[PDB]
Design an enzyme around this catalytic site. Structure first.
Site, PDB file in Angstrom:
ATOM      1  N   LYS A  45     -31.145 -56.506 -49.284  1.00 26.29           N
ATOM      2  CA  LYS A  45     -30.842 -55.825 -48.065  1.00 26.29           C
ATOM      3  C   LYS A  45     -30.046 -56.713 -46.603  1.00 26.29           C
ATOM      4  CE  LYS A  45     -34.815 -53.683 -45.986  1.00 26.29           C
ATOM      5  NZ  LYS A  45     -34.664 -52.486 -45.168  1.00 26.29           N
ATOM      6  N   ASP A  46     -30.896 -57.736 -46.401  1.00 26.68           N
ATOM      7  CA  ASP A  46     -30.550 -58.500 -45.763  1.00 26.68           C
ATOM      8  C   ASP A  46     -29.182 -59.707 -45.473  1.00 26.68           C
ATOM      9  OD1 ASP A  46     -32.533 -57.645 -43.547  1.00 26.68           O
ATOM     10  OD2 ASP A  46     -33.871 -59.325 -44.674  1.00 26.68           O
ATOM     11  N   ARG A 100     -30.597 -45.961 -40.102  1.00 26.59           N
ATOM     12  CA  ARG A 100     -30.739 -45.224 -41.442  1.00 26.59           C
ATOM     13  C   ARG A 100     -31.865 -43.754 -41.831  1.00 26.59           C
ATOM     14  NH1 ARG A 100     -32.611 -45.620 -46.185  1.00 26.59           N
ATOM     15  NH2 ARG A 100     -33.841 -48.591 -45.388  1.00 26.59           N
ATOM     16  N   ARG A 101     -33.008 -44.634 -41.655  1.00 25.26           N
ATOM     17  CA  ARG A 101     -34.218 -44.021 -41.994  1.00 25.26           C
ATOM     18  C   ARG A 101     -34.338 -42.295 -40.549  1.00 25.26           C
ATOM     19  NH1 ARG A 101     -37.371 -49.572 -43.027  1.00 25.26           N
ATOM     20  NH2 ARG A 101     -37.018 -49.525 -45.455  1.00 25.26           N
ATOM     21  N   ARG A 106     -40.754 -53.166 -34.105  1.00 30.55           N
ATOM     22  CA  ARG A 106     -39.968 -54.449 -34.245  1.00 30.55           C
ATOM     23  C   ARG A 106     -41.595 -55.271 -35.662  1.00 30.55           C
ATOM     24  NH1 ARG A 106     -34.812 -54.137 -37.280  1.00 30.55           N
ATOM     25  NH2 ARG A 106     -35.802 -56.819 -36.694  1.00 30.55           N
ATOM     26  N   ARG A 109     -46.507 -54.717 -37.702  1.00 32.74           N
ATOM     27  CA  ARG A 109     -45.545 -53.372 -37.807  1.00 32.74           C
ATOM     28  C   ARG A 109     -46.551 -52.564 -38.529  1.00 32.74           C
ATOM     29  NH1 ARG A 109     -39.339 -51.518 -38.619  1.00 32.74           N
ATOM     30  NH2 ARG A 109     -38.420 -53.968 -38.242  1.00 32.74           N
ATOM     31  N   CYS A 151     -27.381 -53.221 -41.871  1.00 29.72           N
ATOM     32  CA  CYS A 151     -28.815 -53.108 -40.962  1.00 29.72           C
ATOM     33  C   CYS A 151     -28.593 -52.067 -39.837  1.00 29.72           C
ATOM     34  CB  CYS A 151     -29.624 -54.041 -41.282  1.00 29.72           C
ATOM     35  SG  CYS A 151     -30.022 -55.220 -42.436  1.00 29.72           S
TER      36      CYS A 151
END
Ligand SMILES: *Cc1[nH]c(Cc2[nH]cc(CCC(=O)O)c2CC(=O)O)c(CCC(=O)O)c1CC(=O)O
Length: 290
Positions: A62-63, A110-111, A128, A134, A222
């Site tokens: 995804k990165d 997105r989330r 972040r 986190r 992202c």
């Protein structure tokens, strides 16, 4: 004896090194005469690779950029981890059970947009850090929950003590590539490409390819409220779910397409969503970010 030593470049996070070592351990199962060494070090790791300073790297899919530099390739996509988003609640509530006004930590549009589409009476707050940072911020700051990828928590062996609810795609469509790894190498490293073959999981690679074609055609990434998840149906076709949302969750473009060819189905999904207005939405969101 004297064997080729494969140099594997890695970031220093707990997760990066865990995923890197995972891949190495899997490759060792073939019992071929290679040695592996990690060089703790996506664009810098790529330059090192083109310079032959390292031979390969393991990234979260995804990165990954949409286009790899000329001379590099994704030489393997192993069996996918869990694709899903995960809710981690400080006081153990499922999404629908969080109190009105609950603060959910994520820096992902997105989330957050998908969660606001289900509930108005929550707040999405920027967060972040690497996964462990986190989780500490959840404990020690003004967050009631956070969203993380299930895959990261699983790779670290943290899920059991952390996940409150696994979010099905029906309610949070994952980021493109989430839970997949990209093993990058030189295109001309035929010996390493052959070693990587046995680890490649074709059903994962074909699903992710579809996802990636869609994301690239949409100019996603992202920072954009875009999602895509492909899987292989029992009959063998790929099913791709595509989604773009407004940041506030009020407008949702969501489609499903089924087919055999990941390039054709990704491209069709992109064309469908762009005709509906999702690309204009993306472009407007980019205009209003730093
Ligand atoms: C595109 C994007 N990257 C990240 C941060 C990230 N990248 C990889 C992981 C581990 C999961 C995996 O390997 O697939 C993570 C962290 C995580 O998702 O747990 C994000 C998330 C930003 C955030 O929520 O603040 C994104 C964007 C996205 O997922 O939409």
């Amino acid at each position: 004896s004297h064997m080729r030593k494969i140099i594997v470049g890695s970031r220093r996070s707990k997760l990066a090194l865990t995923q890197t070592k995972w891949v190495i351990e899997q490759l060792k199962k073939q019992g071929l005469p290679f040695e592996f060494e990690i060089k703790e070090m996506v664009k810098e790791i790529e330059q090192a690779m083109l310079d032959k300073e390292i031979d390969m790297a393991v990234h979260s899919m995804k990165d990954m950029p949409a286009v790899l530099p000329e001379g590099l390739t994704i030489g393997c996509i192993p069996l996918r981890e869990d694709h899903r988003d995960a809710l981690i609640s400080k006081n153990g509530e499922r999404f629908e059970e969080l109190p009105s006004g609950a603060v959910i930590g994520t820096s992902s549009l997105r989330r957050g947009a998908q969660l606001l589409s289900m509930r108005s009476d929550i707040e999405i707050k920027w967060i972040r850090g690497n996964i462990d940072t986190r989780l500490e911020k959840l404990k020690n700051e003004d967050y009631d929950a956070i969203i993380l990828a299930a895959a990261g928590l699983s790779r670290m062996g943290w899920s059991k003590d952390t996940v409150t609810q696994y979010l099905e795609p029906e309610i949070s469509v994952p980021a493109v590539g989430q839970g997949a790894l990209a093993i990058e190498c030189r295109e001309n490293d035929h010996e390493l490409l052959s070693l990587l073959q046995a680890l490649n999981h074709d059903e994962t690679a074909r699903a992710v390819r579809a996802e990636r074609v869609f994301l690239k055609e949409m100019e996603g990434g992202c920072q954009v409220p875009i999602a895509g998840y492909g899987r292989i149906l029992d009959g063998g076709n790929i099913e791709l779910t595509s989604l773009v949302a407004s940041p506030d969750g009020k407008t949702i473009y969501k489609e499903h397409i089924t087919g055999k060819d990941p390039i054709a189905i990704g491209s069709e999904a992109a064309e469908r969503l762009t005709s509906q207005g999702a690309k204009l939405l993306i472009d407007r969101v980019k205009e209003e970010l730093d």
